[PDB]
Design a protein around this ligand. Structure first.
Ligand SMILES: [La+3]
Ligand SMILES: [La+3]
Ligand SMILES: [La+3]
Ligand SMILES: [La+3]
Ligand SMILES: [La+3]
Ligand SMILES: [La+3]
Ligand SMILES: [La+3]
Ligand SMILES: [La+3]
Ligand SMILES: [La+3]
Ligand SMILES: [La+3]
Ligand SMILES: [La+3]
Ligand SMILES: [La+3]
Ligand SMILES: [La+3]
Ligand SMILES: [La+3]
Ligand SMILES: [La+3]
Ligand SMILES: [La+3]
Ligand SMILES: [La+3]
Ligand SMILES: [La+3]
Ligand SMILES: [La+3]
Ligand SMILES: [La+3]
Ligand SMILES: [La+3]
Ligand SMILES: [La+3]
Ligand SMILES: [La+3]
Ligand SMILES: [La+3]
Ligand SMILES: [La+3]
Ligand SMILES: [La+3]
Ligand SMILES: [La+3]
Ligand SMILES: [La+3]
Ligand SMILES: [La+3]
Ligand SMILES: [La+3]
Ligand SMILES: [La+3]
Ligand SMILES: [La+3]
Ligand SMILES: [La+3]
Ligand SMILES: [La+3]
Ligand SMILES: [La+3]
Ligand SMILES: [La+3]
Ligand SMILES: [La+3]
Ligand SMILES: [La+3]
Ligand SMILES: [La+3]
Ligand SMILES: [La+3]
Ligand SMILES: [La+3]
Ligand SMILES: [La+3]
Ligand SMILES: [La+3]
Ligand SMILES: [La+3]
Ligand SMILES: [La+3]
Ligand SMILES: [La+3]
Ligand SMILES: [La+3]
Ligand SMILES: [La+3]
Ligand SMILES: [La+3]
Ligand SMILES: [La+3]
Ligand SMILES: [La+3]
Ligand SMILES: [La+3]
Ligand SMILES: [La+3]
Ligand SMILES: [La+3]
Ligand SMILES: [La+3]
Ligand SMILES: [La+3]
Ligand SMILES: [La+3]
Ligand SMILES: [La+3]
Ligand SMILES: [La+3]
Ligand SMILES: [La+3]
Ligand SMILES: [La+3]
Ligand SMILES: [La+3]
Ligand SMILES: [La+3]
Ligand SMILES: [La+3]
Ligand SMILES: [La+3]
Ligand SMILES: [La+3]
Ligand SMILES: [La+3]
Ligand SMILES: [La+3]
Ligand SMILES: [La+3]
Ligand SMILES: [La+3]
Ligand SMILES: [La+3]
Ligand SMILES: [La+3]
Ligand SMILES: [La+3]
Ligand SMILES: [La+3]
Ligand SMILES: [La+3]
Ligand SMILES: [La+3]
Ligand SMILES: [La+3]
Ligand SMILES: [La+3]
Ligand SMILES: [La+3]
Ligand SMILES: [La+3]
Ligand SMILES: [La+3]
Ligand SMILES: [La+3]
Ligand SMILES: [La+3]
Ligand SMILES: [La+3]
Ligand SMILES: [La+3]
Ligand SMILES: [La+3]
Ligand SMILES: [La+3]
Ligand SMILES: [La+3]
Ligand SMILES: [La+3]
Ligand SMILES: [La+3]
Ligand SMILES: [La+3]
Ligand SMILES: [La+3]
Ligand SMILES: [La+3]
Ligand SMILES: [La+3]
Ligand SMILES: [La+3]
Ligand SMILES: [La+3]
Ligand SMILES: [La+3]
Ligand SMILES: [La+3]
Ligand SMILES: [La+3]
Ligand SMILES: [La+3]
Lengths: 152, 151, 151, 152, 152, 151, 151, 151, 151, 151, 152, 151
């Protein structure tokens, strides 16, 4: 039982809804001397990945699929993980979580680029490549914030 | 007993379920009114997402801790959701939307009364502004369905 | 015996009479302050037309039916109008404007009391916002006339 | 009618005030599947014909006249008709009322174009011509909405 | 020896250059309690009538003519009059001069509208009508500033 | 013989041929004035496409039916076209452009007279405005060519 | 047989036929969805005119010569046109639009494969971007028609 | 013995002292967060200058006379100021800022109660809106300091 | 015994007193020129607040420490202030404004000379630019008062 | 002897002659560079008109009285003008423009020296800024003519 | 050359810094009838290729590389050539230098498109493709300025 | 023995080395202040590229010939560069930035002295304006490092 382009895209709809909720979690709960800069930065990421999510869902529609569209479906299909905010985290801890999710998305998107190349879906292939370009840039910048190299 | 913090957190959950429902309608709608209502759902997605952020951050400002996971939202919301399995007419989708707007209207009225009793003037006026917008939306979408606002 | 719906509809009529008066002043004014006050009347025309629309649509949203003909506006308004037949000074025109602003202020105060008593919080806060703007205008136009706001 | 340029312009001040109030009536009371589009559309018309009304009144001032400026005067003088909204009307009925008033204004403006041509008031003549150009376009579009040819 | 369309347009090039210089004179030398409003208003008129002047000159070019283009030519052909500012004038006096020049331009433009109608130059005719529309509005407003009716 | 509707439709055809010609010049031009005139052709393309739309919709508004296929445009246009096979200098391209502008000027003059006679004041003033712009373009492009506007 | 230059030129022809068709629909449409779809056709006209310009200029940049007359467009296009004689419903007009979008999708797919084979990476990615937009349009207009995107 | 007019005038004084303090912090701050917080102080300077103007002009509109000299501000303010004599850390400057924000919050709460008791609905809602913003700022600057809003 | 740092700090004090005076005039003015001059005072408030900030930050950049409390401003300013106790005419308020502008002009002339003598080229040119603006304002406000600039 | 007021008035006259010359070039130019230089003359007309207004109003601010009639401008200007009688090449027109720019440059240098001697720091720096722009223009228009700036 | 994706990108950082300085040389030293148009045009190119340079350097960072960041490194590594402006050049000669460098960058970018395709770096591949699209358009337009076909 | 032309050309070289250094810092910086300072370096890159262009074009306008190759910039600059080979802290990078700003400040002071002595008033005021900005930057970046501006 293989995963085709429709199944991959729907999986990323689920992932991206979990991810945007996580971005809001960080936005709301962060504390520390870098608050103002990172508080705004989370708004930027929230918009960007919400747009990605919409575009993925509507590409899935355009190839004849049916996107997940309830919280229950997102939780049942996402590989991105979430956790309630119970005890105080440092800013560095929150950014480590963010970067970890960005790396997860990068690697899964690479799987989807290979898949859509194989299946001959050139539109979806280039869409995913553009998304990955942005993700790679974000990983460099947030790793730099943490004092690390991009692929470290 | 439900206090101001608990009410606001309940609405964080509700509003997250609701914006996802708005996207469901946006994506799955069909029919002659597609282009108009397709765009309208984007307008609503933005407005109620903003409401959600403002509610969560008012909760923070009074010393609370907003729900912030899909699991919590589903565990706590009173807004209902369902997977899109069978085709729905545009009228059916707008009836779902209107029903959820009416639910939020009535719950916001309960929260206005609660915050008025407790003396939280800021939260009270925030909820009042939200309800003003919701009431206008109910009038307009009921009009689309050929009905009066309170019918 | 006057409820919130009847009050709001009364102000629909008042505000239509008032905007026509603002245009009368806009067109017929003369004197050294012409250019500034000519533009100012456009600002007021827009603001109070917006007020009128918001009032009518709030009346709709609470289940009412706004007056929507000149015949109804004349039949129901408490704002007064008179044809421009003989020359008036700029001060006389602004005294008429300020007198009408004072009428609207006091009637809006009655409606704030009414809606606070009947429990319509959305309409109540709407009227309070309008009154804030009207009070500022009264200060400024009294200042133009060389007077304190409440004299 | 037995009307010179000043009397014609003042007549249109009265008409246009009745018309803008009618546009608001339709804006407020309309119902049906076409609500959102036409609801906004009537804001467009309200702005345009209020601007026309101001321009007509101020051209009347500029040629030495005195515009009507009370509701009593508008009602006593307008040929545009109004009626209270008492029983439900379909969207098609509301647009038929709108179109009927647009046709009335078109034909009266044509009378004014001829009159101002004869009297030698070239400014007023060209002003009315521009207004009629817009009215004619509106008539085509709203008849099309109703499924009819522009002059049917 | 009749005046044709080319000669009329060139005459108005001269007039409008004299007029814009007069507007600057008023802008610079005015005093009194209405200074700020009228100081800015003169900038508005300066731009508007400079644009009129450019459009007149380039319409003259487009019909095969050659516009005056030196101060000497403007002074030798304009009917608009100018005078050095030697003794203090009141604001009302300056606006009376402005209105007088506006009325001169209105009446000459009316002559040109008749002329171009007769000669069959429809473009120039409608250009002049549009200009006259604006002039008539200005005359109403500035007469109102002076406490007078537009045609008084 | 030719009435207002037939005249306007003839110009719909002409203007479609003309905008395609403007694109030909835009694409194939070479020489030291490339960048300026390349952009200039974009300006004309927008302007005369807008003219074409306005003419077609005026024709609709007076009860007519605009041509709306390439076959009809070629069948009715008096503007001439030629495939780009041998290289043309910038001056040859601009002389073709100017020649077509002069054709449109003269035909628009005929339509101005016709609509004047028929009493169609709206169409008359529309064509006059168009001709004003065309005359300005003729002056400027003739100047580019080192010539007087009517030479 | 067909190389990249010939493919691109074929699409210059197609896109000119298509934009003229979009104007036909813009002008002749009637029905309750008039205002929304009238504006929508303006959006498509701009988008596919831009596509046409980009294709023609890519053809220039790889050493080719774009078609640039109505005669050539009609001689080479596979997009079909018909004069508007009998009245068409809004659904018929939208089905014609959608049919042409599907033609362009399938032909663009052939060009994507061809340019991939020939090693023209720029042209390949250009056509992919165009096809992304076309696929979205097909989904939305099929939805307007009450159909699934590939039905 | 403090009425609405006296409360508002007290806040005119407080807000002038506060904006000058904001400039002190803007000018003298040092440390790694310099650029971000330097800009942030401009934002606060604008917001609370706007508040000061609105308070003074509301005082005018109810018949009062705002303090309008540095001497009056100093004689009446409850907000404290001190010359910058020795270097302070960014955290110390932000703790001073937050302390003044908390002072303004608590005094506004008193003014909301007072104006509610006296029946000044406009002034009451103005103070509520201001307090909403102040509470949000307290949450954000406390977060910067590593603390909960009410800690 | 006054150097560049002391001169600049003296002007920080002067400019804070001045902007508060501008607000006094803005708030308390009455008469026929109310609307125009009311807005004009906002313009001056912004310009001279900007000057004050630039002066303080230039003082920082040359190693100085700007006054940053109302007490310091009052202890050091040469600009005068007085409480608004009895009504003043618009002409009296503008005469006060002009008097302060002339004071600032003359002191700046001294500062231009001082900084030229001390070799501070940046500060010298900053003061020259400010004085250019002040001189223009003196001409305009004197004109409002019916006087020549130096009368 | 020429003092600062006399110098500035001389430049009011010069600049009025110059802007009229710029329009002459704008209107009468022909040749291949028409569109570029036609627009460029509008840019110059605006810039030197602004210079003229600033010079006249600086003269007002120092107690002077600017020339304000065509007769005065012609009586006092050193910039020369001539009617356009015979065709001029674009190069000839730009040589006239450049010659006038060089005249203004040299006269402005004399005025910079004069105002430096007299101690008018504001006027001095104003003239310096003007000369900076003039020098840049001379470089660019000399480059157009194929020459170095000072050749 | 014997070059992987990181080395290719760094080579283009060096090239693009040499190129932007060349664009300024042309901007500053050009003379002739086409001065104003091409003077502005080079500002356009300076912005575009400086942006390209930044994007290339930051993609290099995002894949774990280290961009050259000194003039010494740029000179030691670039294949784009530069020469001091000593004797006068015609506008055509300057544009021939510009076009020659654009052709060099086009061909090297093509090498990088092939290389990144082979190595599986899809993001970098598509980035380079977009850049080459722009370069090819520029080559057509500047050859047209010179009176030549794009590939002549 | 160094005149104005030689000084300006020296600063052309310096400013090109400096902008490349700004990009080095932009690309290689790491640490908690990354996002703010990353953007800040773009601001500086633009500003000092603009400075460089203005200096080169002023040199042209006074008859000079700017350096325009990397080889010339390296041969002539006094600003230092070093490859980024081992990790540096944000403080170290900003200390390098500030050191270069101080070099440019002091050299610009030398050029201000030089041009004031040689009588080039335009270049003199240009350099003074640049120095004003540089001095402000020195204050702000020293503040970031926790230091006073001139330590
Ligand atoms: La599967
Ligand atoms: La920001
Ligand atoms: La989207
Ligand atoms: La999107
Ligand atoms: La969407
Ligand atoms: La492949
Ligand atoms: La394939
Ligand atoms: La493939
Ligand atoms: La509880
Ligand atoms: La819309
Ligand atoms: La928000
Ligand atoms: La918000
Ligand atoms: La909000
Ligand atoms: La937020
Ligand atoms: La209470
Ligand atoms: La009752
Ligand atoms: La204004
Ligand atoms: La509103
Ligand atoms: La509204
Ligand atoms: La409304
Ligand atoms: La009465
Ligand atoms: La009363
Ligand atoms: La209550
Ligand atoms: La309230
Ligand atoms: La819309
Ligand atoms: La108007
Ligand atoms: La008006
Ligand atoms: La009736
Ligand atoms: La006639
Ligand atoms: La006549
Ligand atoms: La006639
Ligand atoms: La004659
Ligand atoms: La104004
Ligand atoms: La113009
Ligand atoms: La114009
Ligand atoms: La012009
Ligand atoms: La006629
Ligand atoms: La005729
Ligand atoms: La005729
Ligand atoms: La016939
Ligand atoms: La341009
Ligand atoms: La149009
Ligand atoms: La249209
Ligand atoms: La149009
Ligand atoms: La020829
Ligand atoms: La006629
Ligand atoms: La007739
Ligand atoms: La007739
Ligand atoms: La006409
Ligand atoms: La030639
Ligand atoms: La073949
Ligand atoms: La729209
Ligand atoms: La394009
Ligand atoms: La193009
Ligand atoms: La494009
Ligand atoms: La069908
Ligand atoms: La391949
Ligand atoms: La390959
Ligand atoms: La390949
Ligand atoms: La690709
Ligand atoms: La259907
Ligand atoms: La008391
Ligand atoms: La910021
Ligand atoms: La305010
Ligand atoms: La205020
Ligand atoms: La105290
Ligand atoms: La104290
Ligand atoms: La502490
Ligand atoms: La502490
Ligand atoms: La001392
Ligand atoms: La204003
Ligand atoms: La500042
Ligand atoms: La500052
Ligand atoms: La004292
Ligand atoms: La004192
Ligand atoms: La006095
Ligand atoms: La006195
Ligand atoms: La003398
Ligand atoms: La331009
Ligand atoms: La100015
Ligand atoms: La200026
Ligand atoms: La200026
Ligand atoms: La001025
Ligand atoms: La001195
Ligand atoms: La340009
Ligand atoms: La970038
Ligand atoms: La960057
Ligand atoms: La070499
Ligand atoms: La591949
Ligand atoms: La692969
Ligand atoms: La591959
Ligand atoms: La030497
Ligand atoms: La920012
Ligand atoms: La610059
Ligand atoms: La520059
Ligand atoms: La430059
Ligand atoms: La060193
Ligand atoms: La040193
Ligand atoms: La000196
Ligand atoms: La200076």
């Amino acid at each position: 039982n293989s995963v085709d382009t429709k199944e991959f895209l729907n999986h990323q709809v689920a992932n991206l809804n979990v991810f945007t909720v996580k971005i809001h979690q960080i936005h709301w709960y962060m504390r520390g001397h870098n608050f103002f800069t990172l508080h705004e930065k989370m708004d930027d990421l929230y918009s960007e990945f919400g747009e990605q999510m919409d575009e993925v869902a509507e590409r899935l529609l355009a190839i004849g699929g049916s996107p997940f569209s309830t919280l229950k479906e997102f939780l049942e299909n996402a590989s991105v993980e979430e956790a309630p905010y119970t005890k105080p985290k440092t800013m560095d801890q929150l950014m480590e979580d963010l970067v970890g999710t960005l790396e997860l998305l990068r690697d899964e998107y690479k799987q989807g680029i290979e898949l859509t190349d194989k299946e001959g879906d050139d539109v979806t292939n280039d869409m995913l490549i553009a998304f990955k370009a942005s993700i790679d840039k974000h990983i460099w910048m947030f790793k730099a914030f943490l004092g690390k190299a991009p692929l470290e």
